[PDB]
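Ticket #4471: complex job returned nothing on first submit. Input attached below:
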Amino acid sequence: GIFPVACSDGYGGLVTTDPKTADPVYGKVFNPPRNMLPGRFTNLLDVAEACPTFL
Amino acid sequence: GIFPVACSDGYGGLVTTDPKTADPVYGKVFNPPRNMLPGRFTNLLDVAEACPTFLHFDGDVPYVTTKTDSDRVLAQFDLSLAAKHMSNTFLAGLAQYYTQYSGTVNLHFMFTGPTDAKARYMIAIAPPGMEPPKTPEAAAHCIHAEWDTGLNSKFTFSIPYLSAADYAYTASDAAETTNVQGWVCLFQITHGKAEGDALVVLASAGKDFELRLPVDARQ
Amino acid sequence: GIFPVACSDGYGGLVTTDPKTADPVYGKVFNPPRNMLPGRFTNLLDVAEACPTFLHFDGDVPYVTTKTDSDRVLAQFDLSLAAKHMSNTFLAGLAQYYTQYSGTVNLHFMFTGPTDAKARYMIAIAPPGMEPPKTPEAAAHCIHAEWDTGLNSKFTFSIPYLSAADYAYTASDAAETTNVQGWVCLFQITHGKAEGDALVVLASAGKDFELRLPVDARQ
Amino acid sequence: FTGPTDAKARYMIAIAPPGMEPPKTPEAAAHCIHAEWDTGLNSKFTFSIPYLSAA
Amino acid sequence: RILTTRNGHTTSTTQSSVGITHGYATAEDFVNGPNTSGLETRVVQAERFFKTHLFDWVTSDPFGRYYLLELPTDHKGVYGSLTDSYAYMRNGWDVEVTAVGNQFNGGCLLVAMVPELCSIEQRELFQLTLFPHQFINPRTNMTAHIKVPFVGVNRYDQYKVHKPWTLVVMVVAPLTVNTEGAPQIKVYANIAPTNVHVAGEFPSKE
Amino acid sequence: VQLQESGGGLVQPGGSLRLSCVASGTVFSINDISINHLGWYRQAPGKERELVAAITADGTSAYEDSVKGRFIISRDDAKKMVYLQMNSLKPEDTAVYYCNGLRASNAGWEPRFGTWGQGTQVTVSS
Amino acid sequence: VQLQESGGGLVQPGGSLRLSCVASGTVFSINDISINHLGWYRQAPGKERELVAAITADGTSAYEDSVKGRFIISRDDAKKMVYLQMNSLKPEDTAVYYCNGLRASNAGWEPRFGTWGQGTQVTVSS
Amino acid sequence: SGNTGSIINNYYMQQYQNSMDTQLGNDWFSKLASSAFSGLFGALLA
Amino acid sequence: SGNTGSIINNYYMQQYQNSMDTQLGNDWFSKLASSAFSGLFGALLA
Amino acid sequence: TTSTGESADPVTATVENYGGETQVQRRHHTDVSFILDRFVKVTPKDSINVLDLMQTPSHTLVGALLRTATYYFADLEVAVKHKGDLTWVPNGAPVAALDNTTNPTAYHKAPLTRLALPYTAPHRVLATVYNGKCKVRGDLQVLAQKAARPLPTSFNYGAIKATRVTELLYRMKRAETYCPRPLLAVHPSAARHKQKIVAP
Amino acid sequence: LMQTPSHTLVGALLRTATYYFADLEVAVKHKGDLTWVPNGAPVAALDNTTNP
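Support reply: We reran it on our side without changes. The output follows.
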């Protein structure tokens, strides 16, 4: 006997904003170094506080 | 009740390079012993460093004879693994299955003529952006080396890897304009009574040569 | 949310020799006691070593009578589990369900005639690559043994396993040319007043006989 | 060896024990006791004929 | 640069030598296996030199001319009788190639030991430096030396149906005489089996 | 690597021509594409060969204002062919046409980007 | 293990014959195949039986230059039969034909590889 | 120890998958084949 | 260590998935490429 | 860097000879085990196929990179698209066994069926090239030698049979390779042979 | 990544940066079989099956 499972109805469709990942195809790739490049921003609400614009 | 699961859409197809295995059919098979057989290799870039191969010059010969005239250029070609002068080496044959590379390429020169023939040569590299030099005087302003014949009949020179990007392409058989990676030029400075004598030349990988991104173009 | 899973393509079919089980239907059944019944066997290659069986010679008889003439060959046959002389033993019957083998094969000889008949025999093996010997003088240069009748009426000789590969085939009923594993030859050196007396011969497995890769050819 | 500096050569010496006619070609004499040398900076060679017999 | 080799009761001395090339291994692997049942044996009377003629190097041969020599060849000594007395053998090789012309010649040769060579292509000649090899340049040296072990898909072999090695000599630059060199050059070889083993005696001749 | 053409020869002025570009196949290399910019050149006897038209990657078309409005050009990439339509025939058409590609520099289109072509000539004189 | 043939007997010269190989079935053993190389042999009265043709595993066919160009051979493995076509009938055809297999050695093809055949004879004399 | 090669425990209890043996209170051939005489019988020279 | 990247143990025993190697009692190129001579040969000035 | 040419010893010259700098290397993509682990298409036959690794075309990635080794070893995986039921048979077995069901048979399940087979040959290692053949009658000798220089017959992984076979792909696992051989690229006719890279 | 329309949410928010870096995921609805090819490879390789 093998572990019995129950496929469910209404689950598993595609949603364009779900929190889950895909399956890898191409492995062992290394990137060129990009650390400490000038002028980074992480939150789009910090350039809105550091830089005003005209009316 | 049993453990409920949710089959997902877009997952589970067949991909020809995925990292997963199949199901066994036939079990308990033992192999004949094959340990320590002579002549193993694990990385295909170690036989490219331990064993160089010949170049190809006009006439279907892997060498260049000394000229007795006012023109002093022996051979000049673009720097690319797809060049015509490199079409018979092990380096180009292997590189045709990858898309990008980086690092050093070595060249070996060996002199053949008799004991009473002497010569003197020079090799330079011209980076891209300006037409390459035709005369040794003009090429004296690039990166160059210069040697001559003696008791040790071999020389070795490393073409530096110099570019803007971190990697460079191995593809694009040009048959066109727009060189990208530069030229290399072999010159003959002077010679004494060495008419008709040959200088064979080989090619091999360097200390930090690297090759990435495999592909299949059916060559 | 429930645990998401990804059904895979190419997996899960039925295979008639897979290592997995089925689902139970009927439960709580107890068996009558059967412990320590006489005459058990676990490996089918132990009754092949504990119990030899008869050979088959021309005339539907498992023996060979002494000849009174100038020809001294008693029996000669190829070394193969598919040979005709081995078609009735337990070894060939079992080996017809496998593809490869390796190891030793034993042969047993027993003398029958009266107390006042004496004889002397010899057995050799000829490896492949040269036609087998016809005379005892010529066969004296192979691997051979030689015995004679007495109070102990039985002899045992082990055909060595000698080849290039590590395993050898049990298949290929030849009815053709191209022997692969060699011949074995039984000779009669001399004899005293033993006309018409028989020598029966049996066959069995050896210490290190082995059999691998089961198959089903419907024999 | 005596000749000039631009002449080179290569020699071989063998011994044939009694009981069979001696060899005529170097290929055939390669199966006896032999030595083989050539010219260079040291222009001399020395070889010892072994003493081999029944008595 | 003197070097002296010795195999059995034979020797050989050269004065212009650039070393020995050990190709594909420096030692021999397991000789006793489960396929011979422990019946093998060694023959030390079979390890010594023998000579042969290869070809004549004329000034009119272009690049790419080759000469093939299959090992083991027709021999008459004790080794040539081993192949008539037994059914399975194995042994490594030791080769030496010599081309004698004065130091006023030009050109280059390339000797190499190739496992299982069968009609190499024309373009594949540019890559013959993957196998154990050595050059012969009259300006510098006159001799080549190589050493190879036993390779094969089997631990013992039948030399009447399979020849696992091949000695090939190619021309990379033609010969030049320059009115001071020898008009032509003859190439000879010198070969000795190492680590022989045998099993499976045969019946007599007839 | 070298483009062939067909549909030329000796022709009388006033007909209707469709020059055809029998390409060698355009073995052209790596996925860096969308620089596919072909064109047509004419050549005069002893006078430098001049451009006629040029086609951009998708839809733009320019012509020499000598022939502007008279010719029609279009490419068919699904089968990888390009053609040249010839209507409103004038005496000015006597030139050898080369089906080739363009460079698209800042100042103007530059030539091949190739080895050379063969060409087809359409000389009309009444 | 022993191949039968049919289609022979007494026949007049100038007809059209297709000799047929009624094989016993070719029980032939292990998956080591693609050495399937059959052939045909002729036999003369008191003179050693000579080859005629031989078929390789897939497509190659050779004949004795006495009959070269005149005969056509082909095998049908899907049903496992092989045949012999006989056109351009000469007086030279008087021989007994054996449908058998070949050995393909280094020097030349060697014979069976079998027990023996029966044969069919085609003697034509006008 | 038949032809089974999974490494994860069975899902069902052993009571439902198979039948249970009881006790009361081949395999003779493996003892018999081990008792075979190997050495030589007579006096050995050479 | 081929092209395989799962982190959960295999389901089947190692005896059924692959064939088992035995012992008796390339890879020469990685020793050979490491023994290459790098430095300069003659006397160095400047 | 000067040295003796004939000696055949390896020698490498770095960029520190004229003042340069030597950088870091990552060579994961050229390992034999890695690069040879991927599927490769093969032209199949209708009923019976003999699984032999020399049927991959010599121009594909796996085909040529395999053919630059003289001896090799690997397990095998196949992916078959068929109709009916599929039966596998080990090395060196009679051809009648292709009809019996007790041999490993995979019942049809769409779209395809992926299996894993062991290494079942009697030799310790396989070979890509073999020197056994020891090498008017014009065409006779041509087609005699042409068929007298193949490999031996025990260099295979078994056989498969089905009512019809439509696709068949090979994948090698645990690859090991010995004694390298030549590997050549397409010879340009002009000054360079250029692929048309991805570009509009 | 410059083929997303400039008016969508991702398109414009991406276009307010001069330099960027990211991995990629695609979701394709097709007929037949789908072959991917890395950066800078010949256009003939789109026909070979050994590529993913």
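The helical segments of chain A are 47-50. Closing as resolved unless it happens again.
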